[PDB]
Design goal:
This is Integrin beta-3. It is found in: Cell membrane; Cell projection, Lamellipodium membrane; Cell junction, Focal adhesion; Postsynaptic cell membrane. Belongs to the integrin beta chain family. This protein is mostly helical. It has one domain: Single alpha-helices involved in coiled-coils or other helix-helix interfaces. Helices cover 70% and strands 0% of the residues. The longest helix has 30 residues. It is rod-shaped and about 70 Å long. The termini are far apart.
Length: 43
């Protein structure tokens, strides 16, 4: 409405950017969990 406002370039860029950060972390933790598992040693 002249103010299509709903820019959400910022919200979408942020939302898209958010998604990247959240998945990256899941990947980092999963890598760590598997690393722990390859090298057992838990007597």
């Amino acid at each position: 409405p002249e103010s299509p406002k709903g820019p959400d370039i910022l919200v979408v860029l942020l939302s898209v950017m958010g998604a990247i950060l959240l998945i990256g972390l899941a990947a980092l933790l999963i890598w760590k969990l598997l690393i722990t598992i390859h090298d057992r040693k838990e007597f």
